[PDB]
Design a binder for this molecule. Sequence first.
Ligand SMILES: CCCCCCSC[C@H](NC(=O)CC[C@H]([NH3+])C(=O)O)C(=O)NCC(=O)O
Ligand SMILES: CCCCCCSC[C@H](NC(=O)CC[C@H]([NH3+])C(=O)O)C(=O)NCC(=O)O
Lengths: 209, 210
Amino acid sequence: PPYTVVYFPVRGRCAALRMLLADQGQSWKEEVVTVETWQEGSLKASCLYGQLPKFQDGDLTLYQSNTILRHLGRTLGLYGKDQQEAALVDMVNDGVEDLRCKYVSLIYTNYEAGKDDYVKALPGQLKPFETLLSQNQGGKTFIVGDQISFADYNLLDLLLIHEVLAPGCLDAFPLLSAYVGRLSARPKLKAFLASPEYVNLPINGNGKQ
Amino acid sequence: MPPYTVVYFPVRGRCAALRMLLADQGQSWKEEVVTVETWQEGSLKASCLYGQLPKFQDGDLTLYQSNTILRHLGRTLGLYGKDQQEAALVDMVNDGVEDLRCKYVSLIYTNYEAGKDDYVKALPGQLKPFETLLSQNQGGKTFIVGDQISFADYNLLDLLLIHEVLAPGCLDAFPLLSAYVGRLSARPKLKAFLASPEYVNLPINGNGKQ
Ligand SMILES: CCCCCCSC[C@H](NC(=O)CC[C@H]([NH3+])C(=O)O)C(=O)NCC(=O)O
Ligand SMILES: CCCCCCSC[C@H](NC(=O)CC[C@H]([NH3+])C(=O)O)C(=O)NCC(=O)O
């Protein structure tokens, strides 16, 4: 594999980049890190910001999940057709990251106490993405332009973990609903999503979702 | 008229890095200031994609998201490394910067009185990675990545400046970051901007805490 992913045995911040690699027909190696090996301290001290994931592309070593996504977007051509599209791809990815940050905070620090409020506020957080789709060819292709981008995989991951969190949360959004159906049916991605390496890994660290 | 417009509250906040980049690159731009009062009316907010500022216009291209604005400018002004490897390291630095900015913002706006002491205590460990990056790039003598300035240097510069206001002397434990701040603040167009009323006379954050 020109690629190595180093991470804990969870989907978490590596699900989108794994979907991207599978859908793009790329091979990669998973190096898993147990809470025991990490807890020790050795690898953590060697990680730039003391966190995972860690990714290797040949001799290039990178940290930061959005950095890995952008790198694969640049090198495999999933970053829009021109600078204008590349800017909009970024804009969608940063909006996905902002919601992902709220989700992680719910999961890891206020699950049973914050859940109902999170779900109640959910439709307002997803509307921007339905609006974006509505402005790009009636929401019949991808989030930006008419070719898939790295932001499509991150957005897809985000919508799917939110349907696990609040079943039917996309029922009120036709374009977002259809987009998930369509992307999930791309041949290589459909196979990946149905596979044990994806299905049998917990979404998060602590058993909550 | 300038092709660029920045729409934001009258604070340095998340626009300080992108204003330093435009000033340093000798670009002109227009500022459209939104008062707390205009924002409470509610109409401009309902029109923003994610309900927040900043908002930036390049010609008819309207962008939201502070890091998206930096990356767009990095692309169009040639401040994104000399090749693909360099762009990925630029991204890695910027995301590190954003992670620390997020913690800084949380402190300033939701826990300043009680969290300031723990935050300052944990700071050296949050700044070390940037000293390390500098140490690996030509002995910390040039920029954070490669040997041309990138958008990440401006964002990193702002983050280091606001942390020197929060914990004066916090960079004394970091020789490469200290010299780097002094070397960048000395660039002719940037030095002029940093000492001008339009920078100096805006508060760093919205609530009187810094
Ligand atoms: C063990 C439970 C599994 C939980 C997985 C959640 S993500 C793992 C967490 N890493 C991050 O949060 C990385 C954030 C970084 N901004 C990125 O986007 O890559 C970490 O390494 N934390 C370990 C640490 O901080 O030491
Ligand atoms: C007058 C107070 C000073 C403003 C605080 C500094 S940033 C303002 C805040 N915007 C953001 O948090 C932007 C986060 C966004 N991820 C970005 O990187 O651009 C906002 O628009 N908030 C307004 C709102 O959310 O309604």
